[PDB]
Design an enzyme around this catalytic site. Sequence first.
Site, PDB file in Angstrom:
ATOM      1  N   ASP A  35       0.837  -1.197   0.000  1.00  0.00           N
ATOM      2  CA  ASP A  35       0.000   0.000   0.000  1.00  0.00           C
ATOM      3  C   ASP A  35       0.875   1.251   0.000  1.00  0.00           C
ATOM      4  O   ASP A  35       1.343   1.683   1.056  1.00  0.00           O
ATOM      5  CB  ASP A  35      -0.905  -0.014   1.224  1.00  0.00           C
ATOM      6  CG  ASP A  35      -1.822   1.181   1.285  1.00  0.00           C
ATOM      7  OD1 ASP A  35      -1.909   1.911   0.273  1.00  0.00           O
ATOM      8  OD2 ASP A  35      -2.458   1.381   2.355  1.00  0.00           O
ATOM      9  N   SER A 199      -0.480  15.489 -12.128  1.00  0.00           N
ATOM     10  CA  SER A 199      -0.717  15.129 -13.511  1.00  0.00           C
ATOM     11  C   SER A 199      -0.952  16.388 -14.330  1.00  0.00           C
ATOM     12  O   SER A 199      -1.485  17.389 -13.844  1.00  0.00           O
ATOM     13  CB  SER A 199      -1.929  14.197 -13.589  1.00  0.00           C
ATOM     14  OG  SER A 199      -2.300  13.914 -14.924  1.00  0.00           O
TER      15      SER A 199
END
Length: 330
Positions: A35, A199
């Site tokens: 994770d 992004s």
Amino acid sequence: STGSATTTPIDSLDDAYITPVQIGTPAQTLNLDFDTGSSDLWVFSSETTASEVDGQTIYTPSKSTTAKLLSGATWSISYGDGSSSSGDVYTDTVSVGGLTVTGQAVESAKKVSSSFTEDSTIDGLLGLAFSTLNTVSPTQQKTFFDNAKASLDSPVFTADLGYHAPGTYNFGFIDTTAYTGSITYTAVSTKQGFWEWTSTGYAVGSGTFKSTSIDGIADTGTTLLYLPATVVSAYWAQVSGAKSSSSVGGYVFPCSATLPSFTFGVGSARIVIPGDYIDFGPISTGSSSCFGGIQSSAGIGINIFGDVALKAAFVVFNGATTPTLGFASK
């Protein structure tokens, strides 16, 4: 040193991925959920409330000659999906894919919430976010990667998750045969303890690319791709009959649909998520309403590049002095 371990989807939907981890002496092998959005290595154990164990493999520290109670240490964690676990702490030897850390904090669950009990395939979590998020008190503990870093050939790990197929976590090296083209690296902020990056935009299907900054986290422990409501609405508007369902808890779409791809930007590069990766199947057995793999982050407080996005790429978690993330197509 290096390590290399195969990671395997827990079910036919890729709801999560499990990776075998050796703990203790002799080794006890547990299948953990790696994770990158959390920083605790915790396991089902001989200390877990018996009614909360349903098929998981447990760690028994009393059977490990290298286990030592970390005196006074406790931990307690709550995840974004509302699940939680807590307990006490041992140090022990932990190996992943041939890479060994001695003295790793292994957090033994005394209590786990129902969603953990109900998932027999996940024996615990191995956190790979920054150690500043580790919950052990009163002495915070380091992640497996943080403990291994100095010994690694290069201070990196990579995630290469498969679509409906196994993939690989590598530690300490970049497998140049595992991706196509070049790896595009992008800046990371560690201020929230995550692999947080920006992004450069998105496209839906064959549509034109929209240049827009989307801050979010690379999170292997989250199944879906969670993005701003504007982006998610633009995606699902291209699917006839798709709608946001408050009763189901997100966007659903007719199971008869063919989904468009979704592209996200990494600098000037582009990662394409095929439409099929966005299908999470019937909302309930036999239903013709299917659950979408791109969902709004509006109720979260952060955008999450979960497995739906990461499995479309070869992803480098670069833990150099100034961390960065790398993405390549594959």
